[PDB]
Design a protein around this motif. Sequence first.
Motif, PDB file in Angstrom:
ATOM      1  N   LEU A 296       0.835  -1.220   0.000  1.00 29.14           N
ATOM      2  CA  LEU A 296       0.000   0.000   0.000  1.00 29.14           C
ATOM      3  C   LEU A 296       0.856   1.250   0.000  1.00 29.14           C
ATOM      4  O   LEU A 296       0.589   2.209  -0.743  1.00 29.14           O
ATOM      5  N   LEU A 297       1.902   1.283   0.824  1.00 29.16           N
ATOM      6  CA  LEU A 297       2.804   2.429   0.864  1.00 29.16           C
ATOM      7  C   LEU A 297       3.438   2.688  -0.500  1.00 29.16           C
ATOM      8  O   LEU A 297       3.470   3.826  -0.986  1.00 29.16           O
ATOM      9  N   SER A 298       3.894   1.613  -1.149  1.00 28.13           N
ATOM     10  CA  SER A 298       4.498   1.760  -2.478  1.00 28.13           C
ATOM     11  C   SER A 298       3.530   2.358  -3.475  1.00 28.13           C
ATOM     12  O   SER A 298       3.876   3.211  -4.300  1.00 28.13           O
ATOM     13  N   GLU A 299       2.285   1.853  -3.454  1.00 24.62           N
ATOM     14  CA  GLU A 299       1.270   2.340  -4.366  1.00 24.62           C
ATOM     15  C   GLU A 299       0.952   3.806  -4.151  1.00 24.62           C
ATOM     16  O   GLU A 299       0.857   4.599  -5.087  1.00 24.62           O
ATOM     17  N   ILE A 300       0.888   4.225  -2.875  1.00 27.91           N
ATOM     18  CA  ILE A 300       0.620   5.640  -2.598  1.00 27.91           C
ATOM     19  C   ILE A 300       1.777   6.515  -3.020  1.00 27.91           C
ATOM     20  O   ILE A 300       1.592   7.579  -3.630  1.00 27.91           O
ATOM     21  N   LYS A 301       3.008   6.101  -2.709  1.00 30.20           N
ATOM     22  CA  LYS A 301       4.191   6.881  -3.072  1.00 30.20           C
ATOM     23  C   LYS A 301       4.349   7.062  -4.565  1.00 30.20           C
ATOM     24  O   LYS A 301       4.763   8.121  -5.045  1.00 30.20           O
ATOM     25  N   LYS A 302       3.891   6.076  -5.340  1.00 30.35           N
ATOM     26  CA  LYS A 302       3.905   6.234  -6.797  1.00 30.35           C
ATOM     27  C   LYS A 302       2.912   7.299  -7.217  1.00 30.35           C
ATOM     28  O   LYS A 302       3.174   8.153  -8.066  1.00 30.35           O
ATOM     29  N   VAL A 303       1.725   7.288  -6.609  1.00 26.63           N
ATOM     30  CA  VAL A 303       0.692   8.264  -6.922  1.00 26.63           C
ATOM     31  C   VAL A 303       1.118   9.688  -6.603  1.00 26.63           C
ATOM     32  O   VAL A 303       0.974  10.588  -7.433  1.00 26.63           O
ATOM     33  N   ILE A 304       1.692   9.906  -5.417  1.00 22.35           N
ATOM     34  CA  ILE A 304       2.071  11.267  -5.029  1.00 22.35           C
ATOM     35  C   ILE A 304       3.449  11.639  -5.535  1.00 22.35           C
ATOM     36  O   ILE A 304       3.906  12.765  -5.339  1.00 22.35           O
TER      37      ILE A 304
END
Lengths: 161, 154
Positions: free
Chosen positions: B144-152
């Motif tokens: 989840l952290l990886s996915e969010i960091k890609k988005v932002i």
Amino acid sequence: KNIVFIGFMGSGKSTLARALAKDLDLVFLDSDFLIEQKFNQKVSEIFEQKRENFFREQEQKMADFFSSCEKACIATGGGFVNVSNLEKAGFCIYLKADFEYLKKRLDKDEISKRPLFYDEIKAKKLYNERLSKYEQKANFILNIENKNIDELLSEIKKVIK
Amino acid sequence: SLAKNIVFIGFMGSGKSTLARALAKDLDLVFLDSDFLIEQKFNQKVSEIFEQKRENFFREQEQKMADFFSSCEKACIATGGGFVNVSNLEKAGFCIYLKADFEYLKKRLYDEIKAKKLYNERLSKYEQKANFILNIENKNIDELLSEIKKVIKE
């Protein structure tokens, strides 16, 4: 525009900030609690593991945060007075008492910060080193000795107008 | 405009507090939790505040929290399930909706019939106010952290 409470351990900053926040219907922030929440660890544990500098860096992160937020009543740890831009955090109230008065009490929120019976010699030395900072950064100095919460709130409210 | 914060929204059990805290630690940002802040202000658990002061009072307090979040920056914020009912939620920050089926959430953390009814009523709000919809099913915290960091773009 925040109201920031500073002073040494035992000065009842969290208790007073929480009461003023509930009374004025503002947000209550406690720098120590925000650090504990962020790391999922008690302040004592953070100090015991990462040591002094790490904690102070996190206090500076909270000070930066307080410098731009608004409408909060903020309680800070004893060593928070050492952050670089405390005046930007808001109107600073120094809760002041002598060392002998402060050393015989603790606030419930302080249980997680250090041992119940901390070293008195070391604490007095730390207290003496910090007085000039508390005094110089304060916008209002409030001696808290022998005053109940209602009395303290009344004095602060009066100063706020 | 949006405050420069990340705000996690979704139903109870979607892991908002956990993920907000992990992201705050990962990016060295401040971690705020609307429920915890309300609890600290009143020195009472959310359940007790609801029991004694009732829902409207609690929603008023969530609104004061939303207003406060709109004034700050560089925070990772977790919100309660009913926080989507505040006005001007968009001003609080970049909203991430942690999405999962009710049947998935119930296996994590009273009256399942009433809970599903409330879940169904809130879905449209979570979806409409989200800047990013993150399906959390079958994903661990690192994912989840990886996915969010890609988005932002971190």
